[PDB]
Amino acid sequence: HWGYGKHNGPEHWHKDFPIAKGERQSPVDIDTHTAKYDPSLKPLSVSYDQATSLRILNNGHAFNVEFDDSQDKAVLKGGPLDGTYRLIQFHFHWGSLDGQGSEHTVDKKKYAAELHLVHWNTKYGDFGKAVQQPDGLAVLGIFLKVGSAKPGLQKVVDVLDSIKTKGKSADFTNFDPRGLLPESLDYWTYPGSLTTPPLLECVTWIVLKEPISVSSEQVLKFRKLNFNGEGEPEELMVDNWRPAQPLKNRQIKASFK
Ligand SMILES: Cc1cccc(S)c1
Ligand SMILES: [Zn+2]
Numbered sequence: 001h002w003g004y005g006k007h008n009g010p011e012h013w014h015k016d017f018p019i020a021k022g023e024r025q026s027p028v029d030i031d032t033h034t035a036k037y038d039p040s041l042k043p044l045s046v047s048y049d050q051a052t053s054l055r056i057l058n059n060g061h062a063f064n065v066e067f068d069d070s071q072d073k074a075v076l077k078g079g080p081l082d083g084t085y086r087l088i089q090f091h092f093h094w095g096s097l098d099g100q101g102s103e104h105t106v107d108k109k110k111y112a113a114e115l116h117l118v119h120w121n122t123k124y125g126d127f128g129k130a131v132q133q134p135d136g137l138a139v140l141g142i143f144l145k146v147g148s149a150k151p152g153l154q155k156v157v158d159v160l161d162s163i164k165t166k167g168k169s170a171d172f173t174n175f176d177p178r179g180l181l182p183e184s185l186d187y188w189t190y191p192g193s194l195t196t197p198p199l200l201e202c203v204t205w206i207v208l209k210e211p212i213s214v215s216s217e218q219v220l221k222f223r224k225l226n227f228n229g230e231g232e233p234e235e236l237m238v239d240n241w242r243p244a245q246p247l248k249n250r251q252i253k254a255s256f257k
Helices: 151-163 216-222
Strands: 044-047 053-058 063-067 075-078 085-094 113-121 137-146 169-171 187-192 203-208 212-214
Touching: 053 151, 063 151, 075 113, 085 137, 085 216, 137 216, 151 169, 151 216
Parallel strands: 137 203, 137 212
Antiparallel strands: 044 075, 053 063, 053 169, 063 085, 075 085, 085 113, 113 137, 187 203
Protein backbone atom coordinates (compact mmCIF):
# COMPACT_ATOMS: atom_id res chain seq x y z
CA HIS A 1 0.00 0.00 0.00
CA TRP A 2 1.02 3.57 -0.32
CA GLY A 3 3.62 5.40 1.74
CA TYR A 4 6.70 7.61 1.44
CA GLY A 5 9.50 5.06 0.66
CA LYS A 6 11.33 4.20 -2.57
CA HIS A 7 8.81 1.59 -3.56
CA ASN A 8 5.53 3.04 -2.48
CA GLY A 9 6.17 6.81 -2.42
CA PRO A 10 4.70 9.76 -4.33
CA GLU A 11 6.08 8.67 -7.71
CA HIS A 12 4.04 5.40 -7.36
CA TRP A 13 0.75 6.72 -6.12
CA HIS A 14 -0.75 7.32 -9.59
CA LYS A 15 -1.06 3.58 -10.25
CA ASP A 16 -3.65 3.08 -7.46
CA PHE A 17 -4.89 6.71 -7.55
CA PRO A 18 -4.81 8.01 -11.11
CA ILE A 19 -6.09 11.41 -9.97
CA ALA A 20 -2.43 11.85 -8.83
CA LYS A 21 -1.87 13.23 -12.39
CA GLY A 22 -5.14 15.30 -12.33
CA GLU A 23 -5.81 18.93 -13.15
CA ARG A 24 -5.81 20.38 -9.59
CA GLN A 25 -3.30 18.43 -7.52
CA SER A 26 -1.52 19.66 -4.37
CA PRO A 27 0.88 20.84 -3.12
CA VAL A 28 2.27 23.50 -5.46
CA ASP A 29 5.09 25.97 -5.37
CA ILE A 30 3.78 29.47 -4.61
CA ASP A 31 5.58 31.90 -6.89
CA THR A 32 5.11 35.11 -4.88
CA HIS A 33 5.89 37.38 -7.74
CA THR A 34 3.06 35.93 -9.88
CA ALA A 35 0.40 35.43 -7.25
CA LYS A 36 -1.80 38.42 -7.78
CA TYR A 37 -3.37 40.45 -4.96
CA ASP A 38 -7.16 40.01 -5.06
CA PRO A 39 -8.95 42.94 -3.32
CA SER A 40 -12.27 41.02 -3.53
CA LEU A 41 -11.02 38.43 -1.01
CA LYS A 42 -13.13 38.97 2.19
CA PRO A 43 -11.18 38.83 5.35
CA LEU A 44 -10.50 35.25 6.77
CA SER A 45 -12.52 34.24 9.92
CA VAL A 46 -11.07 31.51 12.10
CA SER A 47 -13.44 30.81 15.06
CA TYR A 48 -11.84 28.17 17.25
CA ASP A 49 -13.06 29.31 20.76
CA GLN A 50 -15.43 26.37 21.06
CA ALA A 51 -13.20 23.71 19.42
CA THR A 52 -13.44 20.33 21.17
CA SER A 53 -10.61 17.98 20.58
CA LEU A 54 -11.13 14.32 21.33
CA ARG A 55 -8.25 12.10 20.41
CA ILE A 56 -4.86 11.81 18.68
CA LEU A 57 -4.17 8.94 16.25
CA ASN A 58 -1.02 7.63 14.56
CA ASN A 59 -2.43 6.46 11.18
CA GLY A 60 0.82 5.11 9.84
CA HIS A 61 1.30 8.22 7.60
CA ALA A 62 1.08 11.14 10.11
CA PHE A 63 -0.81 11.79 13.33
CA ASN A 64 -4.25 13.32 13.45
CA VAL A 65 -5.66 15.46 16.27
CA GLU A 66 -9.41 14.83 15.89
CA PHE A 67 -12.28 17.15 16.83
CA ASP A 68 -15.94 16.59 17.65
CA ASP A 69 -17.55 18.00 14.50
CA SER A 70 -21.15 16.99 15.49
CA GLN A 71 -22.09 20.63 16.25
CA ASP A 72 -21.47 24.09 14.96
CA LYS A 73 -18.07 24.75 16.70
CA ALA A 74 -14.65 25.58 15.30
CA VAL A 75 -15.43 27.11 11.91
CA LEU A 76 -13.53 28.68 9.11
CA LYS A 77 -15.28 31.16 6.86
CA GLY A 78 -14.62 34.35 4.87
CA GLY A 79 -11.46 34.70 2.78
CA PRO A 80 -12.14 32.94 -0.53
CA LEU A 81 -14.91 30.73 0.91
CA ASP A 82 -18.64 30.70 0.36
CA GLY A 83 -20.36 29.44 3.50
CA THR A 84 -18.98 27.75 6.54
CA TYR A 85 -16.45 25.00 6.98
CA ARG A 86 -16.21 22.92 10.18
CA LEU A 87 -12.91 21.71 11.68
CA ILE A 88 -12.57 17.96 11.76
CA GLN A 89 -8.85 17.28 12.30
CA PHE A 90 -5.36 18.65 12.00
CA HIS A 91 -2.10 16.93 11.09
CA PHE A 92 1.37 17.80 10.01
CA HIS A 93 3.89 16.88 7.28
CA TRP A 94 7.61 17.12 8.18
CA GLY A 95 11.13 16.27 7.16
CA SER A 96 14.12 14.20 8.40
CA LEU A 97 16.20 17.45 8.40
CA ASP A 98 15.21 21.02 9.10
CA GLY A 99 15.85 21.96 5.40
CA GLN A 100 12.86 20.04 4.11
CA GLY A 101 9.40 18.93 5.27
CA SER A 102 6.78 21.27 3.96
CA GLU A 103 4.49 20.33 1.05
CA HIS A 104 3.84 23.79 -0.31
CA THR A 105 6.93 25.80 -1.06
CA VAL A 106 7.29 29.61 -1.37
CA ASP A 107 9.58 30.62 -4.26
CA LYS A 108 10.94 27.04 -4.06
CA LYS A 109 11.76 27.44 -0.32
CA LYS A 110 10.93 24.38 1.77
CA TYR A 111 10.01 24.89 5.39
CA ALA A 112 10.78 22.28 8.12
CA ALA A 113 7.09 21.21 8.39
CA GLU A 114 3.57 22.18 7.45
CA LEU A 115 0.38 22.09 9.52
CA HIS A 116 -2.96 21.22 7.80
CA LEU A 117 -6.20 22.21 9.64
CA VAL A 118 -8.90 20.32 7.74
CA HIS A 119 -12.45 21.65 7.47
CA TRP A 120 -15.54 20.41 5.58
CA ASN A 121 -18.30 22.49 3.98
CA THR A 122 -21.32 22.21 6.21
CA LYS A 123 -23.73 22.45 3.18
CA TYR A 124 -22.77 18.77 2.50
CA GLY A 125 -23.73 17.48 5.94
CA ASP A 126 -20.59 15.48 6.83
CA PHE A 127 -17.03 14.88 5.70
CA GLY A 128 -17.76 11.80 3.67
CA LYS A 129 -20.28 13.62 1.43
CA ALA A 130 -18.11 16.77 1.32
CA VAL A 131 -15.16 14.82 -0.30
CA GLN A 132 -17.48 14.04 -3.23
CA GLN A 133 -17.62 17.75 -4.08
CA PRO A 134 -15.19 20.16 -5.64
CA ASP A 135 -15.73 22.72 -2.89
CA GLY A 136 -16.13 20.17 -0.10
CA LEU A 137 -12.95 21.01 1.92
CA ALA A 138 -11.03 24.02 3.11
CA VAL A 139 -7.51 23.40 4.43
CA LEU A 140 -5.67 26.09 6.38
CA GLY A 141 -1.96 25.39 5.74
CA ILE A 142 0.62 26.88 8.12
CA PHE A 143 4.42 26.56 7.72
CA LEU A 144 6.76 25.69 10.53
CA LYS A 145 10.34 26.92 10.87
CA VAL A 146 12.81 25.87 13.53
CA GLY A 147 13.74 28.60 16.06
CA SER A 148 11.92 29.50 19.24
CA ALA A 149 9.52 26.90 20.74
CA LYS A 150 5.75 27.18 20.13
CA PRO A 151 4.27 26.82 23.60
CA GLY A 152 0.89 25.95 22.13
CA LEU A 153 2.39 22.90 20.45
CA GLN A 154 3.95 21.33 23.50
CA LYS A 155 0.84 19.37 24.59
CA VAL A 156 0.93 17.64 21.21
CA VAL A 157 4.67 16.91 21.38
CA ASP A 158 4.30 15.50 24.90
CA VAL A 159 1.64 12.93 23.92
CA LEU A 160 3.58 11.49 20.94
CA ASP A 161 5.40 8.92 23.12
CA SER A 162 1.96 7.30 23.70
CA ILE A 163 1.20 6.91 19.98
CA LYS A 164 4.57 5.89 18.64
CA THR A 165 3.34 3.30 16.19
CA LYS A 166 0.71 2.86 13.49
CA GLY A 167 -2.79 2.28 14.85
CA LYS A 168 -2.13 3.70 18.32
CA SER A 169 -4.47 6.42 19.66
CA ALA A 170 -4.70 8.45 22.90
CA ASP A 171 -7.40 10.60 24.51
CA PHE A 172 -6.59 14.18 23.61
CA THR A 173 -9.25 16.47 25.05
CA ASN A 174 -9.28 20.26 25.59
CA PHE A 175 -6.48 21.04 23.11
CA ASP A 176 -6.87 24.59 21.83
CA PRO A 177 -5.76 24.93 18.17
CA ARG A 178 -5.66 28.75 18.46
CA GLY A 179 -2.18 28.25 20.01
CA LEU A 180 -0.83 26.93 16.65
CA LEU A 181 -1.77 30.12 14.68
CA PRO A 182 0.71 32.85 13.70
CA GLU A 183 -0.10 36.57 14.31
CA SER A 184 -1.08 37.43 10.76
CA LEU A 185 -3.82 35.73 8.69
CA ASP A 186 -2.42 37.06 5.32
CA TYR A 187 -2.64 34.12 2.92
CA TRP A 188 -2.42 32.71 -0.62
CA THR A 189 -5.31 30.69 -1.98
CA TYR A 190 -5.84 28.28 -4.87
CA PRO A 191 -8.01 25.20 -5.74
CA GLY A 192 -6.30 21.90 -5.09
CA SER A 193 -6.46 18.49 -3.52
CA LEU A 194 -5.54 16.30 -0.52
CA THR A 195 -1.76 15.79 -0.65
CA THR A 196 -2.20 12.10 0.50
CA PRO A 197 -4.06 9.33 -1.22
CA PRO A 198 -6.87 9.30 -2.14
CA LEU A 199 -5.71 12.68 -3.45
CA LEU A 200 -9.28 13.96 -3.85
CA GLU A 201 -9.79 17.31 -5.65
CA CYS A 202 -12.00 18.94 -3.08
CA VAL A 203 -9.85 21.47 -1.36
CA THR A 204 -9.77 25.32 -1.30
CA TRP A 205 -6.28 25.81 0.00
CA ILE A 206 -5.62 28.80 2.22
CA VAL A 207 -1.83 28.94 2.95
CA LEU A 208 -0.74 31.49 5.53
CA LYS A 209 2.24 33.66 4.63
CA GLU A 210 3.62 33.88 8.21
CA PRO A 211 5.23 30.69 9.49
CA ILE A 212 5.13 29.69 13.15
CA SER A 213 8.38 28.96 14.92
CA VAL A 214 8.88 25.59 16.69
CA SER A 215 11.98 24.46 18.48
CA SER A 216 14.50 22.01 17.27
CA GLU A 217 13.48 19.79 20.30
CA GLN A 218 9.77 19.94 19.30
CA VAL A 219 10.39 18.82 15.71
CA LEU A 220 12.91 16.18 16.84
CA LYS A 221 10.05 14.59 18.80
CA PHE A 222 7.92 14.34 15.62
CA ARG A 223 10.80 12.49 14.00
CA LYS A 224 10.76 9.79 16.79
CA LEU A 225 7.32 8.57 15.64
CA ASN A 226 7.12 5.41 13.55
CA PHE A 227 5.36 4.54 10.27
CA ASN A 228 5.39 0.86 11.25
CA GLY A 229 3.11 -0.86 13.79
CA GLU A 230 4.21 -2.16 17.16
CA GLY A 231 6.41 -5.26 16.84
CA GLU A 232 7.55 -4.40 13.30
CA PRO A 233 10.99 -3.20 12.18
CA GLU A 234 11.33 0.48 13.13
CA GLU A 235 10.88 2.96 10.27
CA LEU A 236 11.03 6.54 11.50
CA MET A 237 8.04 8.73 10.51
CA VAL A 238 10.02 11.36 8.60
CA ASP A 239 9.71 12.87 5.13
CA ASN A 240 5.94 12.33 4.96
CA TRP A 241 5.58 15.12 2.40
CA ARG A 242 4.57 15.09 -1.26
CA PRO A 243 6.64 17.37 -3.52
CA ALA A 244 5.18 20.23 -5.50
CA GLN A 245 2.90 19.27 -8.45
CA PRO A 246 2.21 21.02 -11.77
CA LEU A 247 0.18 24.23 -11.40
CA LYS A 248 -1.67 23.58 -14.69
CA ASN A 249 -4.55 25.90 -15.39
CA ARG A 250 -4.53 27.56 -11.96
CA GLN A 251 -3.99 31.02 -10.49
CA ILE A 252 -2.79 31.57 -6.93
CA LYS A 253 -4.34 34.65 -5.36
CA ALA A 254 -2.87 36.77 -2.48
CA SER A 255 -5.03 38.27 0.24
CA PHE A 256 -2.42 41.04 0.85
CA LYS A 257 -0.44 43.60 -1.11
C1 LIG B 1 -7.56 13.84 5.15
C2 LIG B 1 -6.96 14.98 4.58
C3 LIG B 1 -7.69 16.11 4.38
C4 LIG B 1 -7.09 17.25 3.82
C5 LIG B 1 -5.74 17.22 3.46
C6 LIG B 1 -5.00 16.10 3.67
S1 LIG B 1 -3.20 16.06 3.20
C7 LIG B 1 -5.61 14.95 4.23
ZN1 LIG C 1 -1.98 17.06 4.89
